[PDB]
């Protein structure tokens, strides 16, 4: 079950979603109109783990999502996503994803959430 | 929590979401179907809702939401697209209900989809939170 979380974590309406993908591995955040991504190459991911020490990012991110310990800074075409939980706070630089690239991902994201809801509501009934 | 389902039912990747709104401030009922690119709605008026509920022998004070919820549960929802227009069929129950949908305009459709994506994610996070307990 692909981890994600929403911001603000309050009862206020969520204004952003943060999620991640396969370990092509990446972090994403969107306000559902624009999409920001870490945009990792397999080289720069290792560089990141190395700067930070490792060797899997997903569990740290899952852990921050559960704790609602994710911090988000957005200015323009650049974002930063911060993970608190582990030994060192983790920060990620994100760049805005061009519309034609972001678009099929946003489409797939929404349709995928819905299938998760339908499915989760099934399971919960059991 | 608000009823929805995805199509196609089964293991294949979803191409469409069906959901509904209203019948709580209580707002008029509408059904919405989307491929997450375009949005369609029942675009009900009070007259058209009465006329639909008559077309299939339902009453004015009757909520439609429970039957839609029942179609969603059983994945007994049928969809047609002329692109220009749509049909939705509910077969969750004893009697089938068919709906005419038209395209929702952009300046209204766009903010509804954003809210849908974000709302699902809240729902997912909350549901997945609510599930770990049992």
UniProtKB/Swiss-Prot annotation, chain B:
Post-translation changes: Phosphorylation may inhibit interaction with the DNA-bound XRCC5/Ku80 and XRCC6/Ku70 heterodimer (Ku complex).
Entry keyword DNA damage: yes
Compartment(s) where it occurs, according to its Swiss-Prot or TrEMBL record: Nucleus; Chromosome; Cytoplasm
Domain of life from the UniProt record: Eukaryota
Modified residues (Phosphoserine): 126
Any one GO BP annotation for this protein: double-strand break repair via nonhomologous end joining
GO molecular function annotations of the record: DNA polymerase binding; identical protein binding; molecular adaptor activity; protein homodimerization activity
Known outcome of mutating residue 126 to D: Phospho-mimetic mutant; abolished interaction with DNA-bound the DNA-bound XRCC5/Ku80 and XRCC6/Ku70 heterodimer
Residue span(s) of domain PISA: 29-71
Alphabetical keyword list: Chromosome, Cytoplasm, DNA damage, DNA repair, Nucleus, Phosphoprotein
Outcome recorded upon mutating residue 126 to A: Does not affect interaction with the DNA-bound XRCC5/Ku80 and XRCC6/Ku70 heterodimer
UniProt key word Nucleus: yes
Example of a GO cellular component annotation carried by this entry: site of double-strand break
Main location: nucleus
Family note: Belongs to the XRCC4-XLF family. PAXX subfamily.
Functional note: Non-essential DNA repair protein involved in DNA non-homologous end joining (NHEJ); participates in double-strand break (DSB) repair and V(D)J recombination. May act as a scaffold required for accumulation of the Ku heterodimer, composed of XRCC5/Ku80 and XRCC6/Ku70, at double-strand break sites and promote the assembly and/or stability of the NHEJ machinery. Involved in NHEJ by promoting the ligation of blunt-ended DNA ends. Together with NHEJ1/XLF, collaborates with DNA polymerase lambda (POLL) to promote joining of non-cohesive DNA ends.
Subunit relationships: Homodimer. Interacts with the DNA-bound XRCC5/Ku80 and XRCC6/Ku70 heterodimer (Ku complex); the interaction is direct. Associated component of the non-homologous end joining (NHEJ) complex, composed of the core proteins PRKDC, LIG4, XRCC4, XRCC6/Ku70, XRCC5/Ku86 and NHEJ1/XLF. Interacts with POLL (DNA polymerase lambda); promoting POLL recruitment to double-strand breaks (DSBs) and stimulation of the end-filling activity of POLL.
Domain notes: The N-terminus (residues 1-113) forms a head domain that is structurally related to those of XRCC4, XLF/NHEJ1, and SASS6.
Protein name: Protein PAXX
Origin species: Homo sapiens
Phylogenetic classification of the source organism: Eukaryota, Metazoa, Chordata, Craniata, Vertebrata
Gene that this polypeptide is encoded by: PAXX
